[PDB]
Design a protein around this ligand. Structure first.
Ligand SMILES: *[C@@H]1O[C@H](CO)[C@@H](O)[C@H](O)[C@H]1NC(C)=O
Ligand SMILES: *[C@@H]1O[C@H](CO)[C@@H](O)[C@H](O)[C@H]1NC(C)=O
Ligand SMILES: [Zn+2]
Lengths: 44, 49, 389, 44, 49, 34
């Protein structure tokens, strides 16, 4: 049964870590890209 | 005058053929010839390597 | 957002780039929480309009804004700087109001990442011992490989106080009031004072800080100020904070206290955001509070000419005007912003544009009575004139 | 019980593989798009 | 005339060397000198701080 | 006319890291009668 408990520990660590990329990506698009696209649109 | 009122962009039109306007005299030959230059028109559509 | 307030603007123009900084506080505008501090780097460009126009290139927010006392900006040649004073934090991680724990320095450049430096106990050597330190709102300058900023704060004192107490004809009680005005909580051992702040050797990547204080004998209660460059010479502006509401502007060949001299002009006189009762004519000593800011911009090597914005309170917000004072004492003024409910502050920076002198003024205020405070910017020109009497 | 151990093997493989798209997407936005948006902004 | 027909952008060309066109007279010295200005060319490529 | 671009390595300030800079100039044709 410990094999299952170990398996879940592995799964949780891998997923919880990787999903950090999603948080970073979202922050980038909202903070960096969105604003300048608006500035560019007005300019042209 | 109003023919272009509803066009979004007026850069080009459908072909209006040339006529022999005054080239109707004796020994007067009306013709058409291509220009000397042959220009490139880049990015007509996508390509790859 | 109606629950957000924009305040404590800092604006400076370099060669082609400008630095702009603003604080966002929650509701109160004075003592409210800091939600963020935002710095903008951009250029002044010609967009086919009547005057010069702004063009932001880089917008960046300061991390951990909750531990900052104040920030100010400086601009040079294709580079900008931000100097922030920070406070101590408790074991809980929460900040302790009005305390001092060194400085942060940031370097900004176009199309480039921001570089941060930490200036700690072995990097900064202050003239006296301070309990709290603030960086002058007005901003600073860069000269060669050093930066100059103005600062003020609470300085520990052990000497007898003899404060500057100059006023017009007025009905030793006044000296006592003048001595008390510069004291914090009435304690002789705790003064509020101004000082110069120099950041040495910025290009080395390991900057250090040295300061030099003004003695009470030639200073009023400490306040927000600005460092100017005037040809080969410098100058300093110190805002009103107490009973003396006259212009306080000084000149110096070098950034030092002993070499500083002061102008004899009075205008502008600060009339807004004050609890003082003295009249503009006599300016008698009293215990009161002033929290405004209206700086000037020199138009000559000896500051015999200068431009400024005046503000006067009324029954309907405020009224304002732009003025230029010449070397004969004459003042020419033009009414501005007739459609704005109120303006409370102004900072002016001037430059050459289309072969003439143009100026940009950044002001805090409200367009309508019920609106939240916001920051606005406008531009004008100085016209050279010559009259045959 | 082996049904559970097998189930976890399936879950882990599917998720660990699919999240590769997130890594690729993030790299693209930071390397490709962000830079040119800055170049465009300056131009206009 | 047709030499540039297939170019996408015609701002610059390969170097065409200067010649002493008329500078062939007695005591007539043909030379070349650099200009006085030395202009910046920003953003030739990426950089960092 | 003939223009040239020069790419150089160096430092703007003594303590700076090495960076690459580029500048341009022109060659002016001249003819002198001695
Ligand atoms: C050619 O056309 C003109 C009108 O443009 C006319 O006057 C002339 O008589 C014509 N000549 C012949 C040969 O058709
Ligand atoms: C210089 O060149 C011109 C033609 O451009 C020619 O007429 C002239 O005789 C030449 N003079 C000498 C010294 O070669
Ligand atoms: Zn006058």
């Amino acid at each position: 049964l410990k094999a299952i408990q170990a398996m879940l520990k592995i799964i949780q660590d891998e997923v919880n870590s990787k999903l950090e990329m999603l948080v970073s990506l979202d922050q980038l698009v909202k903070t960096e890209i969105k604003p300048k696209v608006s500035l560019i649109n007005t300019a042209v | 005058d109003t023919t272009d009122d509803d066009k979004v962009d007026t850069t080009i039109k459908p072909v209006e053929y040339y006529k022999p306007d005054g080239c109707n005299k004796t020994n007067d030959h009306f013709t058409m010839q291509p220009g000397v230059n042959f220009y490139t028109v880049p990015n007509l559509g996508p390509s790859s390597s | 957002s109606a629950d957000e307030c924009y305040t404590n603007p800092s604006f400076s123009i370099g060669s082609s780039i400008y630095m702009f900084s603003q604080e966002i506080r929650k509701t109160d505008c004075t003592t409210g929480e800091i939600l963020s501090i935002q710095i903008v780097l951009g250029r002044i460009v010609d967009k086919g309009q009547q005057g010069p126009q702004a063009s932001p290139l880089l917008v960046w927010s300061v991390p951990n804004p909750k531990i900052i006392n104040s920030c100010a900006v400086a601009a040079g040649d294709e580079t900008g700087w931000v100097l922030c004073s920070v406070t101590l934090t408790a074991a809980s991680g929460e900040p302790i109001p009005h305390m001092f724990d060194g400085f942060w320095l940031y370097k900004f450049e176009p199309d480039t990442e921001v570089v941060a430096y930490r200036i700690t106990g072995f990097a900064y050597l202050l003239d006296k011992v301070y309990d709290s330190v603030f960086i002058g709102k007005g901003g600073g300058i860069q000269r060669g490989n050093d930066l100059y900023f103005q600062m003020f704060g609470l300085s520990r004192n052990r000497q007898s106080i003899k404060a500057l107490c100059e006023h017009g004809s007025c009905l030793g009680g006044y000296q006592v009031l003048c001595d008390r005005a510069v004291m914090s909580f009435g304690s002789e051992e705790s003064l509020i004072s101004n000082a110069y702040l120099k950041v040495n050797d910025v290009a080395s990547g390991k900057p250090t800080i040295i300061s030099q204080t003004f003695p009470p004998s030639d200073s009023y209660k400490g306040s927000n100020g600005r460092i100017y460059t005037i040809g080969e010479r410098y100058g300093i502006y110190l805002a009103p904070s107490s009973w003396n509401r006259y212009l306080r502007f000084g000149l110096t060949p070098d950034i030092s206290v002993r070499s500083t001299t002061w102008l004899k002009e009075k205008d502008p006189i600060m009339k807004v955001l004050t609890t003082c009762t003295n009249t503009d004519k006599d300016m008698c000593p009293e215990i009161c509070n002033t929290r405004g800011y209206q700086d000037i911009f020199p138009l000559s090597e000896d500051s015999s000419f200068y431009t400024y914005i005046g503000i006067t309170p009324s029954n309907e917000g405020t009224k304002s005007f732009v003025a230029v004072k010449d070397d004969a004492g004459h003042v020419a003024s033009i009414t501005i912003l007739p459609n704005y409910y109120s303006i409370t502050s102004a900072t002016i920076s001037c430059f050459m544009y289309k072969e003439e002198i143009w100026c940009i003024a950044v002001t805090e205020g409200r367009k309508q009575k019920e609106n939240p405070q916001r920051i606005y910017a406008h531009s004008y020109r100085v016209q050279k004139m010559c009259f045959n009497i």
